[PDB]
């Protein structure tokens, strides 16, 4: 129940609110996205990021952002620009970096 | 705030709870589903069904079911069986038939 665990849970909820349909909520499977596990080797989702917040695995804000950036980068690498998953990733990426940089 | 509006809102919430990702929450567009407007001429969603519940446009349970059936049928007509949207429609269909069968008491 640390001061960082407070801060990252606050950050996560605010980002999860930008994903109302829950595309970033758990891992993408090959059933719904063919070839995903071959193309993306470092998968990331909000679900996984929450499990790391409970298990206290984030030592800094930057470690949280790193995963956040990875999730969005995976989306913008696997999906074409015309897709909803891509566009959502790009918005959410930009919004997330403004939401948790140079603040107090 | 009628006795039918109570009943249909209860029905709607129970079905909407089976669609956590909200694929049935507003109209499908051709941007996300190519050729949808050519294949499906009578689109229906939970959003539209909620607007009709507020504006009291459902005179009976059967009028509600009719739309419910249309939404699910559109899904099972446009999408292939192996897709997420199909399987979700088929579950939601079956759940509605049990929820609103001839035994409503
Ligand atoms: C953002 C991750 C992404 O690229 C993504 C997410 C989804 C995605 C994720 C989902 O749950 C996390 C779901 C919801 N889902 C998954 C299994 N059953 C429902 C989904 O439904 C169409 C699409 C998806 C689908 C095809 C191609 C890419 N994606
Ligand atoms: C169930 C209706 C259906 O068949 C359906 C719904 C969706 C669908 C609907 C959505 O919003 C109501 C959404 C959510 N969305 C779309 C644009 N911004 C969010 C979605 O996620 C990709 C898929 C879809 C997509 C491709 C092919 C069929 N469908």
UniProtKB/Swiss-Prot annotation, chain A:
Summary of subunit composition and partner proteins: Binds acetylated histones H3 and H4. Binds butyrylated histone H4. Component of the multiprotein chromatin-remodeling subcomplex SWI/SNF called GBAF, which includes at least BICRA or BICRAL (mutually exclusive), BRD9, SS18, the core BAF subunits, SMARCA2/BRM, SMARCA4/BRG1/BAF190A, ACTL6A/BAF53, SMARCC1/BAF155, and SMARCD1/BAF60A. Interacts (via N-terminal bromodomain) with acetylated RAD54. Interacts (via C-terminus) with RAD51.
Domain remark in the UniProt entry: The Bromo domain mediates interaction with histones that have acetylated lysine residues at specific positions. Also recognizes and binds histones that are butyrylated.
All copies of domain Bromo, residue ranges: 1-102
Name this polypeptide is given: Bromodomain-containing protein 9
Site positions (Histone H4K5ac H4K8ac and histone H4K5bu H4K8bu binding): 32, 85
UniProt gene name: BRD9
Cysteines joined through disulfide linkages: none
Compartments, as annotated in UniProt: Nucleus
Chain segments carrying region Histone H4K5ac H4K8ac and histone H4K5bu H4K8bu binding: 77-79
Protein task: Plays a role in chromatin remodeling and regulation of transcription. Acts as a chromatin reader that recognizes and binds acylated histones: binds histones that are acetylated and/or butyrylated. Component of SWI/SNF chromatin remodeling subcomplex GBAF that carries out key enzymatic activities, changing chromatin structure by altering DNA-histone contacts within a nucleosome in an ATP-dependent manner. Also orchestrates the RAD51-RAD54 complex formation and thereby plays a role in homologous recombination (HR).
């Amino acid at each position: 129940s640390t001061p960082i665990q407070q801060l990252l849970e606050h950050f996560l909820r605010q980002l999860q609110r930008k994903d109302p349909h829950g595309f970033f909520a758990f891992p993408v499977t090959d059933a719904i996205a063919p070839g995903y596990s071959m193309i993306i080797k470092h998968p990331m989702d909000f679900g996984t990021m929450k499990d790391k917040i409970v298990a206290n695995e984030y030592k800094s804000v930057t470690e949280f952002k790193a995963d956040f950036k990875l999730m969005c980068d995976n989306a913008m690498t696997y999906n074409r620009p015309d897709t909803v998953y891509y566009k959502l990733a790009k918005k959410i990426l930009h919004a997330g970096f403004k939401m948790m940089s140079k603040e107090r």
